[PDB]
């Protein structure tokens, strides 16, 4: 009994590749397209809610997850690997930061923590790498808005805009054509919605598109009043309704 797998399952091949990271990246290639766009006053992250059966209730499956009130994440690849990363990510934001400083971590640092977790699945005994690539979008007082990609190896990069998954090569080109350093958040949402229509096959509406923003503070969404310095979450998930209003002016 007990874990006798105390040795690495990811090792260097004679060519120098790390096989299991490569293979995890392949798994991400197969995954459904997701993307992120950075505007001057906001960030938008979006993906397709490709459903496993029409009897499923795809509202119960949320691919776009809140990590802190100013940070959100979306992914491409293996959904269950993503789920547990979101659990771990939320907790580490508290344990190794908020419980110490009385404020949430800045985007780069929470991203750094996630990368650390994913790096360890690449070297510790008896585990495989995570089969996901993450797009984390957030805001913090001293860095403003930002957007990061995190890969199975634990590597992360900041982006103006990018896409991952199935139709990433096509979508990355679409974004290069349309991105400029003067985009307002509403413009970036419109571009995100266009880029996504390319990769989506079937229905394209508010019930098959999951989309969230990192923008202005939302006092109506805080849950209480009476503290002037607490103005609410900057993370907002667009409703099924809100998406369709934008799809008529498309």
């Amino acid at each position: 009994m007990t874990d006798r797998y105390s040795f690495s399952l990811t090792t260097f091949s004679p060519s120098g590749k790390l096989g299991q990271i490569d293979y995890a990246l392949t798994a991400v290639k197969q995954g459904v397209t997701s993307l992120g766009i950075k505007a001057t006053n906001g960030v938008v992250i979006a993906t397709e809610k490709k459903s496993s059966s029409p009897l499923a209730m795809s509202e119960t499956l949320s691919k776009v997850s809140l990590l802190t009130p100013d940070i959100g994440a979306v992914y491409s690849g293996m959904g269950p690997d993503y789920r547990v990363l979101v659990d771990k990510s939320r907790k580490v934001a508290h344990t190794s930061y908020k419980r110490i400083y009385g404020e949430y971590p800045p985007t780069k640092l929470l991203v750094s923590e996630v990368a650390k977790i994913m790096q360890e699945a690449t070297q510790s005994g008896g585990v495989r790498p995570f089969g996901v690539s993450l797009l984390i979008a957030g805001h913090d007082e001293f860095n403003g808005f930002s957007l990061y990609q995190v890969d199975p190896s634990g590597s992360y990069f900041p982006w103006k805009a990018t896409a991952i998954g199935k139709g990433s090569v096509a979508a990355k080109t679409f974004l290069e054509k349309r991105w400029n350093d003067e985009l307002e958040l509403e413009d970036a949402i419109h571009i995100a919605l266009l880029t996504l229509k390319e990769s989506v096959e079937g229905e394209f509406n508010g019930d098959t598109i999951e989309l969230a923003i990192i923008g202005d503070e939302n006092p109506d969404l805080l849950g209480y009043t009476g503290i002037p310095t607490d103005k609410g979450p900057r993370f907002r998930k667009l409703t099924s309704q809100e998406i369709n209003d934008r799809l008529e002016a498309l």
Binding site: R4, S6, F7, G125
Partner: protein, 240 residues
């Protein structure tokens, strides 16, 4: 923890990991030790296929374990650091409990003991290192030189070499070292040592290091010039 028996017996009775650790030593830059009548000299090759070296801060190949004992080696540099550290700690621990610095035999025996332990413990490979350990016992004037190797065996040597082309220079020393009469002086002993290295090295350029150990913690390294004069002198005496 990681448990695997890496060092194990083969059907013919060989422990291949110990033997492959010895190949790593064979690959390492040559090092040699010669003991005189009142001194021991440690000479070490340095691969000159690297210019742009900073030799101020690059780790020297001979190391002081205590103020009266030195350790050179051939093999994996990173492995040697672990042995060197352990030896230095035991040297201080011995002073602390016995109120006397280590004898050379004792220090050698300890390092050898460590090397052996890694040949029958789970989860670990043997040290890719053999050492020459030299010095003078406290309050003693008889010179000491020992050798250790990955298996854990150790013994005393009138003079000895290890590393690449060590067979060539062992050959040299075997016909040039009179047991009946060791090099009577420091200068004599340093010459014989340099000579043996010149069989194998290349130019006597940034290639040879020499360190001299005399009784009562009297250990000093030579500089380029000091060494170069020996290189120069022998090659003139050569053309015959």
């Amino acid at each position: 923890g990681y448990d695997r028996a890496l060092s194990i017996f083969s059907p013919d009775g060989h422990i291949f990991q110990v033997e492959y650790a010895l190949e790593a030593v064979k690959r390492g830059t040559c090092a040699v030790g010669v003991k005189g009548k009142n001194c021991v000299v440690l000479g070490c090759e340095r691969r000159s296929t690297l210019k742009l070296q900073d030799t101020r801060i690059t780790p020297s190949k001979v190391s002081k374990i205590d103020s009266h004992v030195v350790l050179s080696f051939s093999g994996l540099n990173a492995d040697s650091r672990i042995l060197i550290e352990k030896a230095r700690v035991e040297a201080q621990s011995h002073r602390l409990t016995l109120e006397d610095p280590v004898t050379v035999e004792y220090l050698t025996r300890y390092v050898a003991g460590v090397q052996q332990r890694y040949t029958q413990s789970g989860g670990v490979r043997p040290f890719g290192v053999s050492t020459l350990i030299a010095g003078f016992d406290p309050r003693d004037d008889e010179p000491k030189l020992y050798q250790t190797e990955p298996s854990g065996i150790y013994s005393s040597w009138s003079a000895q070499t290890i590393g690449r082309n060590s067979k060539t220079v062992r050959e040299f020393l075997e016909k040039n070292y009179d047991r009946k009469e060791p090099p009577a002086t420091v200068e004599e002993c340093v010459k014989l040592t340099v000579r043996s290295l010149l069989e194998v090295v290349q130019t006597g350029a940034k290639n040879i290091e020499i360190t001299v150990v005399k009784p009562d913690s009297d250990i000093v390294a030579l500089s380029s010039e000091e060494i170069n004069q020996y290189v120069t002198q022998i090659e003139q005496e050569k053309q015959e």
